[PDB]
From Swiss-Prot, chains C, D:
This is Auxiliary capsid protein. Interacts (via FD region) with the major capsid protein. It comes from Bacteroides phage crAss001. Residues 75-237 are annotated as: FD. Auxiliary capsid protein that forms an outer layer on the major capsid protein protrusions. The central region FD is structurally similar to Helicobacter pylori flagellar cap protein FliD. It is found in: Virion.
Swiss-Prot record, chain E:
It comes from Bacteroides phage crAss001 (Bacteroides phage PhiCrAss001). It comes from the Viruses. Interacts with the auxiliary capsid protein (via FD region). Interacts with the head fiber dimeric protein. Interacts with the head fiber trimeric protein. Interacts with the portal vertex auxiliary protein. It is found in: Virion. This is Major capsid protein. Capsid protein self-assembles to form an icosahedral capsid, with a T=9 symmetry, about 77 nm in diameter. Each asymmetric capsid nonamer is covered by 9 capsid auxiliary protein, 1 copy of the trimeric head fiber protein and 2 copies of the dimeric head fiber protein. Displays an HK-97-like fold with an insertion domain that protrudes at the capsid surface. The chain holds residues 52 to 101 of 504 of the full protein.
Amino acid sequence: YNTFSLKLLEDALYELSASKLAMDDRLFVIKTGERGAIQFHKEVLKTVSGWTTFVFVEYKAPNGVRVRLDVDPFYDDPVRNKILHPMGGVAFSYRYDIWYIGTQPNIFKCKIKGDNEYRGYQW
Amino acid sequence: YNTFSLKLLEDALYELSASKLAMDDRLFVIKTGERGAIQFHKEVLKTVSGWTTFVFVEYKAPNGVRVRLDVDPFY
Amino acid sequence: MVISINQVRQLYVAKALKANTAALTTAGDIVPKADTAKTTLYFQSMSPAGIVASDKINLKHVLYAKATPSEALAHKLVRYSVTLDADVSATPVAGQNYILRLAFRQYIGLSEEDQYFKYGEVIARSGMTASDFYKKMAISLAKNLENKTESTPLVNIYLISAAAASTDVPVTSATKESDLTATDYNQIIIEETEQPWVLGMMPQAFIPFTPQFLTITVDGEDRLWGVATVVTPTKTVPDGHLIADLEYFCMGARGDIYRGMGYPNIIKTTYLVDPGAVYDVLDIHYFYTGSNESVQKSEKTITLVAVDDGSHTAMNALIGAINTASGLTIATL
Amino acid sequence: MVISINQVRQLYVAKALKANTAALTTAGDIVPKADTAKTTLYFQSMSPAGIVASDKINLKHVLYAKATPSEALAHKLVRYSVTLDADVSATPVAGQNYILRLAFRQYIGLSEEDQYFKYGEVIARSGMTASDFYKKMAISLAKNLENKTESTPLVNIYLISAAAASTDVPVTSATKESDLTATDYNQIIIEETEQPWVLGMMPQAFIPFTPQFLTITVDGEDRLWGVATVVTPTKTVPDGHLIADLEYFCMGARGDIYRGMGYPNIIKTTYLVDPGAVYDVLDIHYFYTGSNESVQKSEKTITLVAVDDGSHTAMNALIGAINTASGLTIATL
Amino acid sequence: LDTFLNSFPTREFEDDNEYYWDVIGSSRRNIPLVEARDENGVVVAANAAN
């Protein structure tokens, strides 16, 4: 996106949870920085919008699905992120990662038995 | 500043807590008088803004960082 | 200017090139020395305390040897040109607060990567034109960044009048609109600055920036008014301070590693690099392999500095001597 | 007017200067007395009860001696000129409520620093011009600050018509638009006032102010309409009340320190300063050093007042006598 | 102001010498670019292909 829209994010939640939901396990998580968290809150806390807030704050999209902002700190890391957004901050902070959460894990990091011992001293 | 802006104060909170945060230890404290506290509340308690209030009142900037006005008397 | 080393770096100053060891009289005098068979190469340099000889270079173990022109080590000072875009409005719109932001990548005293801002406020009225806007925005920037209170600004502000188009009109924290009497101001330029340098404590370093413009309402639409284009630099920062630090650090590899630590009980080293002069550098990377069972390489490098006078005369002669002695084919500048 | 003292202050009134001690007949008559060698200086003054002599001044121990012109101790009455700025609008905008504020730094009866306001309301309609606005704003101010209900206003309100430009038109809590029939009112002036003074209970004191204007919407923008400029004062407050208090306090250093405390059982002191007259002051700071082991200084001062008649004649003669006697070089007014 | 200044803690020192403190950051660092050169050492211009 070149310009932000709460509609696109509502359409995304629709895509993720339209008939796949269960009305009781629709925990979502949006991950972004602080400048994206701004765009989100500026448009979400309005009244013309359909979101309502539930004080750990959680949101409930007009779709009826439970949302949870997790503003991560690395989305603003000025080391790996270099390009600047005309509206301030690093453009990687204007970036949402919307993941369906529920109940076996969808993501896991693979490991091999005995990989913590591969330390050698050539002295 | 010659004219007030809630943007400048949001940019300041960004500067302070952009990647330095931890999502659980971002306690901020804004200290000012009562006329500045006015400018703050007049613009913060709007709905077009991104702040939400948490009744000892505490605020949560659109950045997601926890804020606390401490209107000091010496200002 | 602590650096990374391939196990060592040594620096010798070629303040003067002499033909024989007997002519080494002043400190800095140097002569490249190699046998007739061209098996080893070494340098005899006059230190303040007698002539010292460099390490011996087995001319079969030379990995690379290239020289620099002293223009590669210079840092051009970045400067943008700020201007309000005729798309939003070719002239300021009344009532709107124009707030300019300078996004610095480091703080003033630190080198860690962070986001650091400085601002400039201007509130436009019914009659304010472009010239008056640039004027008041420049003065606001100066009073906000040139609040140094100790040393010097973080960037320098100038104005260009349409008549000059090339004469940067400086603006400082003391300037006031009475001093700026033109009516054809068409842009604002913001150059980088040479920050404080100390010989072995503060390395030469810069803080880049980006002019960011906040949003104004023009026709009910929040919009960006500015154009932060990058005009070509006109000022430069030579390597004298950069080279002097190289010497300061690389003289602890043959000299005293402590330098002021036990301050009363110290050894003080005399340095021959003149910070303020421009040096063109030469470097020779070589290694020592060893004997049976000792194939591991000990790679090394010997670098040599020489003042540039436009044409890289001094270094060109020094390498010509080294090619005549060691038969190498180092290229001239 | 309790004051700070360098261990003492004594005041004697120079109601009349006489040449010899024999001529001291009326209370206030004074003569400077010094020997021929000019070692000590003292003053012989006629009190209501016989002639009293001042402390003796060792003319080697005189720290300073300067006289004042009675214009230094006068307090000009501050007055602004209020006006609506032609930038926002050269004439009132209908529907908007113009609210003027007078930011006082103390309350009316207290001297502690506080923020104390008084307001003036005017609501503008389609036909109201500048004159009518100043008129109604002035009457609102008067009815809001001249609600004294005991004594007197806290500031005085006037109007200036463009025809006069110099004739302040007073406005009081009783005034009404029928009394103000002009159409060329162009400003409002707000002077300070002489507050109540009591001899030894209420010191002379003022309460400064600043006309502050609240915000109106003109084109959807909240803006300030007023111009609170500081025109030059035209009225003054002399020192008679200020000097009279000096005497009241400094007569407790040679006289009775209680003054009405045990009211039936008191001693009442006769004071020779005429509150209502203007005095020019003189002062002589000196000290007593002492003997062996007693080097500590006991610094003192003797001040003398004399009525000014334009030219500081009385004091000029008094110092001329003192210079003739003690050889000092005090300067004339 | 005393309340404001009691909000801060106290460190008790032994003398009245100038005091100092160290400040450290992290190794994670961006490095700017001087230029880029092709396979034959020619400097990459802006108006050039990949």
